[PDB]
């Protein structure tokens, strides 16, 4: 995961409100979450990867081993079963809850870390650069 490790700042967002709607996030949480622009930190220690926020909305921190399911409480307070794998150089994060599923892909492209959040047919793209 070397090219992912670091501190990343949000530079652009498209369709994130629509993504959150499709996920089922309520109005007030969408408004506050949509404004929040924390930097996102990826660190690695051995086989354990950590993804952490620093948010004005809600701080989060997940630690995991690739391929191994874990419990995650998302920023919008869903309790999900998550699995994150590294597929062709892309981190692929699947969240399962209440019979539903969403996938978040994170990939390096040029000097960007591009996050693609997909819920059914809705995709949001959020672009980060090194802080
Ligand atoms: C905030 C939120 C709500 Cl309320 C609801 C559903 C999904 C959400 O976030 C999903 C989501 C949005 C986003 O901007 N990022 N940025 C990263 C990222 C960027 C660089 C390095 C590591 C991780 N991961 C995500 N995941």
Curated annotation (Swiss-Prot):
<dbReference type="GO" id="GO:0005634">
    <property type="term" value="C:nucleus"/>
</dbReference>
<keyword id="KW-0597">Phosphoprotein</keyword>
<feature type="binding site">
    <location>
        <begin position="126"/>
        <end position="128"/>
    </location>
    <ligand>
        <name>a fatty acid</name>
    </ligand>
</feature>
<dbReference type="GO" id="GO:0051427">
    <property type="term" value="F:hormone receptor binding"/>
</dbReference>
<dbReference type="GO" id="GO:0005324">
    <property type="term" value="F:long-chain fatty acid transmembrane transporter activity"/>
</dbReference>
<dbReference type="GO" id="GO:0120162">
    <property type="term" value="P:positive regulation of cold-induced thermogenesis"/>
</dbReference>
<feature type="modified residue" description="Phosphotyrosine; by Tyr-kinases">
    <location>
        <position position="19"/>
    </location>
</feature>
<keyword id="KW-0446">Lipid-binding</keyword>
<dbReference type="GO" id="GO:0042632">
    <property type="term" value="P:cholesterol homeostasis"/>
</dbReference>
<keyword id="KW-0007">Acetylation</keyword>
<keyword id="KW-0539">Nucleus</keyword>
<dbReference type="GO" id="GO:0009617">
    <property type="term" value="P:response to bacterium"/>
</dbReference>
<comment type="similarity">
    <text>Belongs to the calycin superfamily. Fatty-acid binding protein (FABP) family.</text>
</comment>
<keyword id="KW-0963">Cytoplasm</keyword>
<dbReference type="InterPro" id="IPR012674">
    <property type="entry name" value="Calycin"/>
</dbReference>
<dbReference type="GO" id="GO:0071285">
    <property type="term" value="P:cellular response to lithium ion"/>
</dbReference>
<dbReference type="Pfam" id="PF00061">
    <property type="entry name" value="Lipocalin"/>
</dbReference>
<dbReference type="GO" id="GO:0036041">
    <property type="term" value="F:long-chain fatty acid binding"/>
</dbReference>
<dbReference type="GO" id="GO:0005829">
    <property type="term" value="C:cytosol"/>
</dbReference>
<comment type="function">
    <text>Lipid transport protein in adipocytes. Binds both long chain fatty acids and retinoic acid. Delivers long-chain fatty acids and retinoic acid to their cognate receptors in the nucleus.</text>
</comment>
<dbReference type="GO" id="GO:0045892">
    <property type="term" value="P:negative regulation of DNA-templated transcription"/>
</dbReference>
<dbReference type="GO" id="GO:0071356">
    <property type="term" value="P:cellular response to tumor necrosis factor"/>
</dbReference>
<keyword id="KW-0813">Transport</keyword>
<dbReference type="GO" id="GO:0005737">
    <property type="term" value="C:cytoplasm"/>
</dbReference>
<feature type="modified residue" description="Phosphoserine">
    <location>
        <position position="12"/>
    </location>
</feature>
<dbReference type="GO" id="GO:0005811">
    <property type="term" value="C:lipid droplet"/>
</dbReference>
<dbReference type="GO" id="GO:0050873">
    <property type="term" value="P:brown fat cell differentiation"/>
</dbReference>
<feature type="modified residue" description="N-acetylcysteine">
    <location>
        <position position="1"/>
    </location>
</feature>
<dbReference type="GO" id="GO:0005504">
    <property type="term" value="F:fatty acid binding"/>
</dbReference>
<dbReference type="GO" id="GO:0015908">
    <property type="term" value="P:fatty acid transport"/>
</dbReference>
<dbReference type="InterPro" id="IPR031259">
    <property type="entry name" value="ILBP"/>
</dbReference>
<dbReference type="InterPro" id="IPR000566">
    <property type="entry name" value="Lipocln_cytosolic_FA-bd_dom"/>
</dbReference>
<dbReference type="GO" id="GO:0070062">
    <property type="term" value="C:extracellular exosome"/>
</dbReference>
<feature type="short sequence motif" description="Nuclear localization signal">
    <location>
        <begin position="21"/>
        <end position="31"/>
    </location>
</feature>
<dbReference type="InterPro" id="IPR000463">
    <property type="entry name" value="Fatty_acid-bd"/>
</dbReference>
<dbReference type="GO" id="GO:0050729">
    <property type="term" value="P:positive regulation of inflammatory response"/>
</dbReference>
<protein>
    <recommendedName>
        <fullName>Fatty acid-binding protein, adipocyte</fullName>
    </recommendedName>
</protein>
<dbReference type="GO" id="GO:0015909">
    <property type="term" value="P:long-chain fatty acid transport"/>
</dbReference>
<dbReference type="GO" id="GO:0050872">
    <property type="term" value="P:white fat cell differentiation"/>
</dbReference>
<comment type="subunit">
    <text>Monomer. Homodimer. Interacts with PPARG.</text>
</comment>
């Amino acid at each position: 995961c070397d090219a992912f490790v670091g501190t990343w700042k949000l530079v652009s967002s498209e369709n994130f409100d629509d993504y959150m709607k499709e996920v089922g996030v309520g109005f007030a949480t969408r408004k506050v979450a949509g404004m929040a622009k924390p930097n996102m930190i990826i660190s690695v220690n051995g086989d354990v990867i950590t993804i952490k926020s620093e948010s004005t909305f809600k701080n989060t921190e997940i630690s995991f081993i690739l391929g191994q399911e874990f419990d995650e409480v998302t920023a919008d307070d869903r309790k999900v079963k998550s699995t994150i794998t590294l597929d062709g150089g892309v981190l692929v994060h699947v969240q399962k809850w209440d019979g539903k599923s969403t996938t978040i892909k994170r990939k390096r492209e040029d000097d960007k870390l591009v996050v693609e959040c997909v819920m059914k047919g809705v995709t949001s793209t959020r672009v980060y650069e090194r802080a």
